[PDB]
Design a protein around this ligand. Sequence first.
Ligand SMILES: CCOc1ncccc1C(=O)N(C)C
Ligand SMILES: [Cl-]
Ligand SMILES: [Cl-]
Ligand SMILES: [Cl-]
Length: 163
Amino acid sequence: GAMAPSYRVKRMDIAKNDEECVVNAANPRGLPGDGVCKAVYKKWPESFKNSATPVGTAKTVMCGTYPVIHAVGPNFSNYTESEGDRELAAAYREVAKEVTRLGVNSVAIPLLSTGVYSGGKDRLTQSLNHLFTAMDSTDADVVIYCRDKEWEKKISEAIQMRT
Ligand SMILES: CCOc1ncccc1C(=O)N(C)C
Ligand SMILES: [Cl-]
Ligand SMILES: [Cl-]
Ligand SMILES: [Cl-]
């Protein structure tokens, strides 16, 4: 565990993280994909061997000794708001199980279902609150990665509000 488990946010490419493992915002088919998934494919392509897994689940594959946790959030273009909310919560619960099982002291995590799976809706708060619900009982240092300057501010505010 970390000595004083924390949440932090950084605005940069998650493929350049300084943590002991990474969460990929994966597709269910283990394809290279776009956005975070394509950056993860370029950095850790070995981790996409048998990485296909259903919506609402996470599957870990090692790149050398570095763990890549493939977490499959729902595409809100296809799911109802109700069913999508349930699957997005479940994907983060499976990430917390994997982080715990691996025994890492830190994890880099993107906000699932906030990009091309958002159905064009702002889901910062929805996705971040499911992240907190899952990860609050873990003792890893969590570092959230984003690309937008206004999102960095809003994620940082949400973290500081609870401290
Ligand atoms: C910066 C705002 O971003 C978005 N807003 C609404 C829907 C999707 C996005 C997006 O593609 N993100 C990568 C988060
Ligand atoms: Cl960068
Ligand atoms: Cl997405
Ligand atoms: Cl972002």
